[PDB]
């Protein structure tokens, strides 16, 4: 396999389906990436994450650099070996969670909840972890942001994108074996989104993320910004919408040209009692499920829906049992993978617009 | 398969190995029974509990009757169906955890941490859960106990053993499909142990538990009491030592004629960071393991020791991650099953005394 090859197999309007080939495996797009916080997808062994259909997971740089430490993970063989996941890993840059502190043009210094993160250090940590898809280090633009602040922050992020590119390229083993994605900023402002897209394409990346959304703006606004923002990115490279999340957000974002997603929702939701179904989310802790012998979802093909009832899962979550977290998280990540598979097949078959309409009619019935 | 058949295949001194055949499966003895509290072996799917080699698990009556409720579990199809374990389940009587309240000769009334438990109600709950091995309801004798108190309590327990026998026999489906074990009491006093054994054998049970030990008396005392107590039980029925536990306690107890064990140690220990090894227990949270790439135990055949290092498990437990509990509990229960398998093979081969000596020399090196 090549270091990185994105191929588009089918299109329907702005939606695309295809594959990213990398040394550790093929990623089917549109893709959903389960999030590994602290070198684990919560409550799942890697083999179970793979069994749900995930082709790649996301590792959070911020957490790893605090615990267990990036240099420590490198000494032990890298993140893949440490956690037992041998397929591609995308790592974030660590900066978002820094904000979630002294900031300057060099980078940010912060106290662990004393550390430093610059574009160079972020790319180095992602190298030490052995990441396959490395994210450029950007500056977070809060929502809402004034035009002036959004512009200053976008400009700093483009300076840091060039620094990230040069740091990644300076390290032979990383340049030869991993891919580097740039992140578009500009808040909700079309002209800044355009300047950001132009700058990132001038520098050149393997893929392009749409940053700064899912920050409180609401779905209509998010979709309006995607409407003009995604077409500004190079068409022939993957488009990654960072931190997006809800099933309906994913369907609308695919309709607008997005190829990759991550979110903690299905894992975090799981442990909190929220289960996704084709008829909308349910909260399994609700007393109405205490004697319900049906599976979480009537159509879901996951091992949890094969084997255990809503009533059992209700009891486990109400009792605070670990197996309740395990079962809820496996089902929710399987549900997301089945959604992505339905999206991919419907685009491949030229019936994605109908699928989106059918999905919305039922999910919101 | 028959309702209940215990066959002894080999003996070495007081140690025996053999099988209990029941309708839901065969139990290899000496047996260790993982404990399911609240209708789950903590942090393990049933298929994983089975993969470790367990032939039967223990369900705690007290917890189940509070949450989710015995009548509720019966309405949903019984405990096997509810939790997805289709092999034998032994249920305790619920009384111990009641103590762990108004007591009388009829039974005990208590407030959930308002309920009632008598011999009749306990046998009924175990029926509603669909237990395969039902324990008679006894009265707990605290350690230490005076001779007079231990005698009064033992006598009450023998009265309740007859009540348990008659309640179990009055229910056709339970009498035909499950087995009933009696519990010997008498604290540390030989004459009371003998009177208790005589009473239980007069009533007649499918198996006999040694109750009231592992209550603070220490291993030398426990072993001294087993020395005279176990020979008082019918030789041709299984002998169950309730709530025993540590690997060395199990080896010594088998040397004294015990065939069945349960304890929360390997599960509870797991989540707390204690991992069993042939060289003794380790606490994985210790900093000495932070860069240790060896598996938890160098000889262990479990899936955790195949796949993950001490360093990774150290990180997961220190980070409070669910997968750390999952991996530690799977390894510890697998370790217990491998211990029982080594015990069974060594008795079968007439080399159990040597095995016990070799085990002690290394476990305590
Ligand atoms: N580096 C970075 N991480 C992120 N996570 C979620 C969002 C939005 C985001 C971003 O805009 N930038
Ligand atoms: N019913 C009962 N349960 C028990 N668990 C642990 C011990 C000891 C015990 C007992 O002596 N009786
Ligand atoms: Zn499911
Ligand atoms: Zn092991």
Author numbering:
A (entry chain A), B (entry chain A): 11 to 110, 115 to 127, 132 to 383
Quoted passage from the original study:
Transfer RNA–guanine transglycosylase (Tgt, EC 2.4.2.29) catalyses the exchange of a specific guanine base in tRNA molecules by a substituted 7-deazaguanine. Bacterial Tgt functions as a homodimer in which the protomer consists of a (βα)8 barrel harbouring a Zn2+ binding subdomain close to the C-terminus. The reaction follows a ping-pong mechanism including a covalent Tgt⋅tRNA intermediate. Hence, in an attempt to generate a model system for the active site of human Tgt and to gain insights into the relevance of particular amino acids for substrate base selectivity, we adapted the Z. mobilis Tgt active site by site-directed mutagenesis in order to mimic that of the human enzyme.
Also the electron density maps of the Tgt(Val233Gly)·queuine and Tgt(Cys158Val/Val233Gly)·queuine complex structures enabled reliable placement of the 7-deazaguanine scaffold of the ligand which is, in both cases, similarly bound as in the Tgt(Cys158Val)·queuine complex. In both maps fragmentary density is visible for the dihydroxy-cyclopentenyl substituent (7H as well as 8F, 8H). Figures 7F and 7H show that the mutation of Val233 to glycine results in a considerable gain of space in the substrate binding pocket which allows the dihydroxy-cyclopentenyl of queuine to occupy the cavity located between Gly233 and the side chain of Cys/Val158. Within this cavity the dihydroxy-cyclopentenyl apparently has no specific interaction with the protein. As a consequence, it seems to be highly flexible which is reflected by the ill-defined electron density assigned to this moiety in both structures. The crystal structures of Tgt(Val233Gly) and Tgt(Cys158Val/Val233Gly) with queuine reveal that the Val233Gly exchange allows the dihydroxy-cyclopentenyl substituent to occupy the created cavity between position 233 and 158. The adopted binding mode of queuine will not interfere sterically with the sugar-phosphate backbone of bound tRNA. Yet, the results of the trapping experiment suggest that Tgt(Val233Gly) is also not able to bind queuine after the formation of the covalent enzyme·tRNA complex. It must be noted that in the case of all queuine complex structures determined in this study the electron density assigned to the 7-deazaguanine scaffold of the ligand by far does not comply with the nominal resolution of the respective structure. Even in the case of the mutated variants where reliable placement of the scaffold into the binding pocket was possible the electron density within this area appears rather fuzzy or even patchy and lacks detail. It is likely that multiple conformations and the low occupancy (on average 60%) of queuine in the binding pocket provoked the poor electron density.
